[PDB]
Design an enzyme around this catalytic site. Structure first.
Site, PDB file in Angstrom:
ATOM      1  N   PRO A 103       1.112  -1.353   0.466  1.00 56.69           N
ATOM      2  CG  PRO A 103       0.133  -0.661   2.102  1.00 56.69           C
ATOM      3  CD  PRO A 103       0.448  -1.542   1.410  1.00 56.69           C
TER       4      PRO A 103
ATOM      5  NE  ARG B 135      -4.543   6.845  -4.349  1.00 56.05           N
ATOM      6  CZ  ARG B 135      -3.858   7.018  -5.575  1.00 56.05           C
ATOM      7  NH1 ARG B 135      -4.280   8.780  -5.344  1.00 56.05           N
ATOM      8  NH2 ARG B 135      -3.468   6.711  -6.632  1.00 56.05           N
TER       9      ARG B 135
ATOM     10  CB  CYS C  38       0.315  31.727 -16.373  1.00 59.83           C
ATOM     11  SG  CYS C  38      -0.228  33.061 -15.984  1.00 59.83           S
TER      12      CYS C  38
HETATM   13  C1  LIG Z   1      -0.730  34.852 -20.871  1.00 61.02           C
HETATM   14  C2  LIG Z   1       0.640  33.907 -21.204  1.00 61.02           C
HETATM   15  N1  LIG Z   1       1.233  34.187 -22.013  1.00 61.02           N
HETATM   16  C3  LIG Z   1       2.161  33.342 -23.229  1.00 61.02           C
HETATM   17  C4  LIG Z   1       2.365  32.704 -22.866  1.00 61.02           C
HETATM   18  C5  LIG Z   1       3.341  31.304 -24.136  1.00 61.02           C
HETATM   19  O1  LIG Z   1       2.928  30.230 -24.773  1.00 61.02           O
HETATM   20  P1  LIG Z   1       3.030  29.424 -25.593  1.00 61.02           P
HETATM   21  O2  LIG Z   1       4.465  28.486 -25.319  1.00 61.02           O
HETATM   22  O3  LIG Z   1       1.947  28.612 -26.178  1.00 61.02           O
HETATM   23  O4  LIG Z   1       3.747  30.208 -26.805  1.00 61.02           O
HETATM   24  C6  LIG Z   1       1.541  31.461 -21.911  1.00 61.02           C
HETATM   25  C7  LIG Z   1       1.938  29.965 -21.702  1.00 61.02           C
HETATM   26  O5  LIG Z   1       1.167  29.859 -20.078  1.00 61.02           O
HETATM   27  C8  LIG Z   1       0.863  32.718 -20.885  1.00 61.02           C
HETATM   28  O6  LIG Z   1       0.585  31.997 -19.828  1.00 61.02           O
HETATM   29  C1  LIG Z   2       3.860  -2.278  -8.080  1.00 63.59           C
HETATM   30  C2  LIG Z   2       2.862  -1.355  -7.004  1.00 63.59           C
HETATM   31  N1  LIG Z   2       2.621  -1.401  -5.875  1.00 63.59           N
HETATM   32  C3  LIG Z   2       2.286  -0.288  -5.559  1.00 63.59           C
HETATM   33  C4  LIG Z   2       1.386   0.765  -5.963  1.00 63.59           C
HETATM   34  C5  LIG Z   2       0.968   1.392  -4.424  1.00 63.59           C
HETATM   35  O1  LIG Z   2      -0.412   2.475  -4.953  1.00 63.59           O
HETATM   36  P1  LIG Z   2      -1.500   2.249  -4.753  1.00 63.59           P
HETATM   37  O2  LIG Z   2      -0.187   4.308  -3.678  1.00 63.59           O
HETATM   38  O3  LIG Z   2      -2.613   3.023  -4.668  1.00 63.59           O
HETATM   39  O4  LIG Z   2      -1.776   1.357  -2.622  1.00 63.59           O
HETATM   40  C6  LIG Z   2       2.457   1.215  -7.370  1.00 63.59           C
HETATM   41  C7  LIG Z   2       1.745   2.416  -7.400  1.00 63.59           C
HETATM   42  O5  LIG Z   2       2.003   2.838  -8.998  1.00 63.59           O
HETATM   43  C8  LIG Z   2       2.374   0.046  -8.191  1.00 63.59           C
HETATM   44  O6  LIG Z   2       3.241   0.372  -8.908  1.00 63.59           O
END
Ligand SMILES: Cc1ncc(COP(=O)(O)O)c(C=O)c1O
Ligand SMILES: Cc1ncc(COP(=O)(O)O)c(C=O)c1O
EC number: 4.1.1.20
Lengths: 434, 434
Positions: B291, B293, B358
């Site tokens: 476990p 989580r 952003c």
């Molecule tokens: C306000 C703002 N300007 C510019 C960008 C740049 O976007 P892109 O990487 O798609 O050009 C972002 C991306 O989050 C943004 O939030």
């Molecule tokens: C082999 C294996 N065991 C245990 C876990 C733990 O899962 P959980 O956090 O849902 O209990 C994971 C999660 O990826 C796993 O891959």
């Protein structure tokens, strides 16, 4: 190869800027990010060449404010600063990096929907070109903070223009339902700007709009430009003048290599011809764009060595040492990246490529045709220069990877990897648990 | 409140292990992770209590191999080690932390589909209880590496049992199309184990299976157990005995507080009653669960201070200083986490809660009814002890947050926050970019 202007296959091997990729993997270890300095210069120069017409015809300035959120590695930002590029920062951390990268303050704009008082103090002290105000609450905090420091803050306003919902429903839904910006239609954006003109410690300098990302159609941009300019006309009818119009970023890059998509030139033809329709109603403003992905994505490649091949009843899996913690796009968005074997072989086969994390979604690509994969081969995942290292993490207790810059000057390590000791370097065990 | 056994509302304020939450936020800063030591003890004790009948009726051991991928902060792992818990590790980094946490090698199992030679050398030198072999390629590497070290490696086999695709379609699909495990149906698992039996440097000790995560229905686990044991019989018929049966992790926790879900007792009844039906075909083995989580999720709370309140035509937004880089679940999986104001109010309202990045997906919850929100209030986001800090990152150049452990011994800082200098501490500027 579309968009990957500096890579090639020579003598049956993959090269980036003339450097053998497999040899890079050998000298620096895997997983490894390789950033092409020349590809970044090419992407940046495409914007300059495409948009210089703005300055030529209006006498105003054209500013590329690189969106740091795409990749704020200090060497990359210093490269961009040295090219004359500005910066779109969204946090005190990005503003700190922009200033340490020597980006001139008048080419820095600050975006963000939860700007804190400390971040505002920082922007005022650094005298950035503008805070792109996201809400009236932010405007009030900026004016109060500017008053405390005995200064005047420059403010632009991020608006959500009245985009035609019939012609652009997805853009429209985003502008109305997301957390950002000042709604224009309901009157919020006009209320905020009129409030700022009555405040004594802020100076109104522009309007800003950013509509989305990885947009490979020029249409949304034309509609954004029309509606932003329509609002500039509405402001002018109230006696209000706008010095700067910042149209944000979002130009898509060619992740898929089979179809052409709009370029910087297409974007400029669209924006510039649209804005010039308004020249008799308002004075033409300085123009700012905030490209992120379109400046750095195609310059980045991620190399991962193959440690295991596994045939199953349904698919042949190739397991590499790169994983979702190094580059989260496929796991997070099921996004497509082109992938190749760095070595040309005389046989090809269809395989799915995965990293070694416990996450079912830690798969870089499925049913890909690649030159025959052998343990020890190095695969290259294309177009990871943006939202690659910037979203990397330590999931599954894996250190963030090394990154090198390939340049005419040589290949340089620009990010060191994290060791097992780095994984716990912020952890502190209490006395009763020692 | 289901699952959150150590928190309460007292005198109109939220308390974690008897410590006032707003005061913790004020003392240590926000955003702040708070891990309840007692809640972890409670969760762990429920497993030990539920499965005690295994050793009572079979004389064999029941081992809890805590899945480090859920949270591997050094104080947390040393706490679990002191409690007598074992470790399910998936990388050399997690094995490293487990050994520095003093978890005994006999209670450590190593999972993963891309185990590297370096990682295998570590597990062999640490004499771990078992490598849960994912493929025949891994088996071969383990054997070769053990030979080179002059040691013998212990190997279990992660299998994909013949789950009934008519009754459990989602489960069967994952098992077949996902990158993990050795397929039983096709004969691959038997071939792998018979191969190991012929190798000189490996020791066959068990079978392993892990079907999914956040499962709140006992059914899939009954199917898993039945099919894993069916293979154990098929192995017995071949003259092959199995010392350990490890059924993985995956029990779900109560993110939604309105409905009852299976508990550890429910899981134990299903598993132990199903396994005992084979008592006349094979000797009962040691039983291991993994476990993650269900041991730590409900012990973690993320406190975020409200900096701005924003009214828009579609929704009223409350902007906090916690963001998706601090806790990625809502942004990545659109997962639900219960959220409350830490101060009880005489009025409630429906609001959406977002961080400051952003990215449009950086929203913790939409249309949530909260006690009246004011700027300066502290919100608590429940159940973030698992896949919270372990997936945190620096997106938008934001440092990862502080984390405190609330205990009968006091409140201890167990993770220091990252400063702006830390953001660029691995970046290196090449000479021509200086
Ligand atoms: C306000 C703002 N300007 C510019 C960008 C740049 O976007 P892109 O990487 O798609 O050009 C972002 C991306 O989050 C943004 O939030
Ligand atoms: C082999 C294996 N065991 C245990 C876990 C733990 O899962 P959980 O956090 O849902 O209990 C994971 C999660 O990826 C796993 O891959």
């Amino acid at each position: 190869m579309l968009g990957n202007d500096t890579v090639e296959i020579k003598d049956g091997r993959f090269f980036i800027d003339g450097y053998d990729a497999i040899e890079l993997a050998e000298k620096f270890g895997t997983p490894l990010y390789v950033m092409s300095e020349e590809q970044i210069k090419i992407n940046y120069n495409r914007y300059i060449e495409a948009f210089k017409r703005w300055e030529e015809e209006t006498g105003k300035e054209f500013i590329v404010a690189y969106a740091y959120k795409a990749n704020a590695n200090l060497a990359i930002t210093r490269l961009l600063a040295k090219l004359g590029c500005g910066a779109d920062v969204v946090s005190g951390g990005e503003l700190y990096i922009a200033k340490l990268s020597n980006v001139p303050s008048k080419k820095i704009v600050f975006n963000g929907n939860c700007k804190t008082k400390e971040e505002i103090i920082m922007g005022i002290e650094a005298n950035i070109r503008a805070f792109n105000v996201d809400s009236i609450s932010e405007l009030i905090l900026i004016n109060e903070t500017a008053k405390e420091l005995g200064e005047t803050a420059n403010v632009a306003f991020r608006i959500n223009p009245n985009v035609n919902p019939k012609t652009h429903p997805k853009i429209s839904t985003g502008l109305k339902k997301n957390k950002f910006g000042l709604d224009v239609e309901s009157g919020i954006a006009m209320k905020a700007i009129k409030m700022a003109l009555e405040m004594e410690y802020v100076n109104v300098v522009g309007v800003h709009c950013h509509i989305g990302s990885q947009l490979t159609d020029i249409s949304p941009f034309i509609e954004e430009t029309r509606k932003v300019m329509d609002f500039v006309v509405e402001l002018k009818e109230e006696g209000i003048e706008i010095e700067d119009v910042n149209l944000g970023g979002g130009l898509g890059i060619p992740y898929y290599k089979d179809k052409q998509i709009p370029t910087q030139k297409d974007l400029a033809d669209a924006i510039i011809n649209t804005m010039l329709k308004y020249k008799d109603k308002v004075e033409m403003p300085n123009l700012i764009l905030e490209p992120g992905r379109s400046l750095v994505a195609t310059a980045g490649y991620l190399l991962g060595k193959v440690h295991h091949i596994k045939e199953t009843p349904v698919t042949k899996w190739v397991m590499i040492d790169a994983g979702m913690n190094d580059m989260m796009r496929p796991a997070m968005y099921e996004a497509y990246h082109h992938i190749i074997n760095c070595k040309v072989k005389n046989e090809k086969e269809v395989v799915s490529i995965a990293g070694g994390l416990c996450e079912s979604s830690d798969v870089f690509g499925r049913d890909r045709e690649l030159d025959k994969v052998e343990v020890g081969d190095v695969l290259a995942i294309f177009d990871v220069g943006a939202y690659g290292i910037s979203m990397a993490n330590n999931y599954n207790a894996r250190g963030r990877p090394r990154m090198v810059l390939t340049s005419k000057k040589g290949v340089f390590l620009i990010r060191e990897r994290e060791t097992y000791a780095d994984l716990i370097a912020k952890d502190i065990v209490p006395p009763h648990l020692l």
